[PDB]
Design a protein around this ligand. Structure first.
Ligand code: BGC
Length: 450
């Protein structure tokens, strides 16, 4: 290593996000927010209206179910809410990994999967979760994909992201689909709310902190939601909210700008993806893609600089063979001779023996990729704050694996938001962590009292 350094040098330079560039990115973001709000097709930012005009206050009460469909995991939960003082009295939930074949199969089978798991969960209901009366179960549905919302409890799928590809479902109503799946298992359920995962995170965060104004998800995918003034949404007039507010789902994963520090590797990832040209910003930020970027750099060094000897390892040529959790562990390796980077490369790529020089390169690459994504996340948040005129206490409710379980990532993001804000503003913005959100929104729309 060995001209491996030349590629390393270039990639580091092409990925650079000095503050000037973050300011340019934030400014481009704020511009797209205005464009996206002014016209349905005016921006890469769809700026979807959620039909949430009232956020949780804390006085919600009753029994509520919630469904949560993400990119890789599905969740079923129920909660007892006891008002202002009691809040969440009791909570139960089960999590199921989604069988990969369901991601690209048919619509019915995806929704059967959801309905059948929910039915099994419902059957375990007992004690304090016993359905009172004389009543019907009420459900909140978190659905982590772009939706053209028609009401709080309805909307059609716009497109898939995160490796999903069920074309049958594009344009079809998500709640109607679930409703038909619920009919097939003979489960009676009132869907009171359908929300994007950013929206639920925002509702859940605002429930615990009145000053929450936005939510950002940095997990398998990436996205953000925020509370916008109704008058600042010229494209939409299908309701006159008394609050004067409306929560927006930005779908910022799809953001693109010439100021984005893209490399040949991000280009090849994109061109070979399931959704080429879409989710450009998501593909350099989210946990789905970070490892895959790493994989493409290492493959480049393997075939042109003999990083792994004369023969390129066969497992390096397989897409998504390197996951982001592999990256973060290697990134955390503070040890001489870098034990962890060594055992991760061996375990995952089936390469015996790596010099110190090779694992120093790998840990450097990990840092370059994680830092870019984190700093770009900060520029995103700063873009939202400028839209809000907030560039006075603002809280950003965060969720997702990258922010919760990747120390380097979440710390770099907070540092760079701080630098972006500056002495004046920084000291009035707080980034904090904690589904329940969708249930809280169902709770405001319950046909029952307590
Ligand atoms: O889960 C985080 C985000 O992932 C993106 O790929 C989806 O399009 C969004 O709807 C979601 O909010």
């Amino acid at each position: 290593w060995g001209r491996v350094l030349a590629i390393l040098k270039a990639f580091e330079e092409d990925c650079a996000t000095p503050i000037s560039k973050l300011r340019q990115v934030a400014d481009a973001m704020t511009v797209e927010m205005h464009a996206g709000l002014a016209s349905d097709g005016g921006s890469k930012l769809k700026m979807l209206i959620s039909y949430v005009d009232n956020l949780p206050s804390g006085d919600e009460k009753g029994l509520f179910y919630a469904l949560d469909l993400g990119g890789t995991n599905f969740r079923v939960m129920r909660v007892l809410l006891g008002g202002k003082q009691e809040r969440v009295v009791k909570q139960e939930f089960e999590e199921v990994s989604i069988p990969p074949h369901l991601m690209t199969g048919g619509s019915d089978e995806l929704f059967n999967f959801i309905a059948e798991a929910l039915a099994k969960f419902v059957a375990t209901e007992c004690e304090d979760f016993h359905l009172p009366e004389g009543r019907q179960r009420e459900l909140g549905f978190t659905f982590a994909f772009p939706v053209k919302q028609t009401s709080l409890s309805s909307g059609s799928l716009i497109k898939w992201t995160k490796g999903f590809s069920i074309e049958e479902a594009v344009g079809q109503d998500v709640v109607g689909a679930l409703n038909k799946a619920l009919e097939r298992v003979g489960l009676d359920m009132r869907i009171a709310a359908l929300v994007n995962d950013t929206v639920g995170t925002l509702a859940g965060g605002r429930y615990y902190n009145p000053d929450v104004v936005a939510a950002v998800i940095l997990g398998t995918g990436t996205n953000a939601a925020y509370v916008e003034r109704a008058t600042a949404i010229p494209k939409w007039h299908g309701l006159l909210p008394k609050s004067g507010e409306m929560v927006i789902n930005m779908e910022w994963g799809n953001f693109r700008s010439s100021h984005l520090p893209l490399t040949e590797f991000d280009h090849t990832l994109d061109f070979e993806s399931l959704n080429p040209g879409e989710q450009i910003l998501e593909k350099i930020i989210s946990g789905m893609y970070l490892g895959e970027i790493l994989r493409r750099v290492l493959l480049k060094m393997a075939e042109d600089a003999a990083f792994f000897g004369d023969t390129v390892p066969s497992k390096l040529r397989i897409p998504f063979i390197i996951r982001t959790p592999h990256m973060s562990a290697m990134h955390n390796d503070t040890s001489p001779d870098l034990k962890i980077v060594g055992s991760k490369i061996k375990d995952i790529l089936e390469v015996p023996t790596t010099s110190l020089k090779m694992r120093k390169v790998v840990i450097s690459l990990c840092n370059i990729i994680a830092t870019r994504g984190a700093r770009l996340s900060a520029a995103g948040i700063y873009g939202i704050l400028k839209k809000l005129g907030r560039d006075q206490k603002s809280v950003i409710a965060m969720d997702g694996g990258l922010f919760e379980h990747y120390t380097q990532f979440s710390e770099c993001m907070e540092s760079s938001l701080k630098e972006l804000l500056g002495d004046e503003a920084s000291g009035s913005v707080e980034v904090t962590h904690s589904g329940i959100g969708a249930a809280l929104l169902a709770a405001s729309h319950s046909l029952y009292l307590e």
